[PDB]
Amino acid sequence: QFTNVSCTTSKEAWSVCQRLHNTSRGKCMNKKARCYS
């Protein structure tokens, strides 16, 4: 239940946490998208 996209800013990839699962809690690391439901 994790994503493997590319992220830099923790606001960018919040429509990736929505469309995959059904949440709006998400932060990313150094280089990749993660989700925090």
UniProtKB/Swiss-Prot annotation:
Compartments where found: Secreted
Disulfide bond entries: C7-C28, A13-A33, C17-C35
A cellular-component GO term for this protein: extracellular region
Tissue specificity: Expressed by the venom gland.
Predominant subcellular localization, coarse grouping: secreted
Alphabetically ordered keywords of this record: Antibiotic, Antimicrobial, Calcium-activated potassium channel impairing toxin, Disulfide bond, Fungicide, Ion channel impairing toxin, Neurotoxin, Potassium channel impairing toxin, Pyrrolidone carboxylic acid, Secreted, Signal, Toxin, Voltage-gated potassium channel impairing toxin
Gene Ontology MF: a single term: potassium channel regulator activity
Highest taxon above the source species: Eukaryota
Site (Basic residue of the functional dyad): K27
One GO BP: defense response to fungus
Protein's UniProt keywords contain Ribosomal protein: no
Region of interest called Interaction with Ca(2+)-activated K(+) channels, as start-end residue ranges on this chain: 26-33
Site features described as Aromatic residue of the functional dyad, chain residue numbers: Y36
Functional description taken from the UniProt entry: This toxin inhibits numerous potassium channels: shaker (Ki=227 nM), Kv1.2/KCNA2 (nanomolar range), Kv1.3/KCNA3 (nanomolar range), Kv1.5/KCNA5 (Kd>100 nM), Kv1.6/KCNA6 (Ki=22 nM), KCa1.1/KCNMA1 (IC(50)=5.9 nM). It blocks channel activity by a simple bimolecular inhibition process. It also shows a weak interaction with nicotinic acetylcholine receptors (nAChR), suggesting it may weakly inhibit it. It also exhibits pH-specific antimicrobial activities against bacteria (B.subtilis, E.coli and S.aureus) and the fungus C.albicans.
Note: Negative results: does not or very weakly inhibits Kv1.1/KCNA1, Kv2.1/KCNB1 (Ki>2 uM), Kv3.1/KCNC1 (Kd>1 uM), Kv11.1/KCNH2, KCa2.1/KCNN1 (IC(50)> 1 uM), KCa2.2/ KCNN2 (IC(50)> 1 uM), KCa2.3/ KCNN3 (IC(50)> 1 uM). Does not inhibit the growth of Gram-positive and Gram-negative bacteria.
Domain notes from UniProt: Has the structural arrangement of an alpha-helix connected to a beta-sheet by disulfide bonds (CSalpha/beta).
Sequence similarity: Belongs to the short scorpion toxin superfamily. Potassium channel inhibitor family. Alpha-KTx 01 subfamily.
Protein name per its UniProtKB record: Potassium channel toxin alpha-KTx 1.1
